[PDB]
């Protein structure tokens, strides 16, 4: 797994409320967070499957 999977979720400086998935490396699962709408980082996915496919295991 890519190092980016270990980064904390980043909402960013925009004020939208867009529900996205991030890999929570401490729990070993993809969870939702609120993305603000601009300046997304890599541990930000539109679906749980893509999240899990990129960053997970079991």
Q: Map out the domains of the chain as residue ranges.
A: 1-58
d(CA 29, CA 18): 19
Method: X-ray
Distance of CA 15 to CAs 8, 44, 51, 55, Å? 19, 16, 23, 27
* Resolution of this deposited model, Å: 1.0
d(CA 13, CA 25): 24
Q: What are phi and psi of 49, to 5 degrees?
A: -65, -45
Architecture of domain 1-58: Irregular (4.10)
Q: Where are the alpha helices (DSSP H) in the chain?
A: 48-55
Choose among 20, 4, 23: nearest CA to 12. Answer: 20
Strand partners, 19: 34
- φ/ψ region of 55 (left if φ > 0, alpha if ψ in -120 to 50, else beta) reads alpha
Token pair belonging to 56: 């997970």
């Amino acid at each position: 797994r890519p190092d980016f999977c270990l980064e904390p979720p980043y909402t960013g400086p925009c004020k939208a409320r867009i529900i996205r998935y991030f890999y929570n490396a401490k729990a070993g699962l993809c969870q939702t967070f609120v993305y603000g709408g601009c300046r997304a980082k890599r541990n930000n996915f539109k679906s749980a499957e893509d999240c899990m496919r990129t960053c997970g295991g079991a």
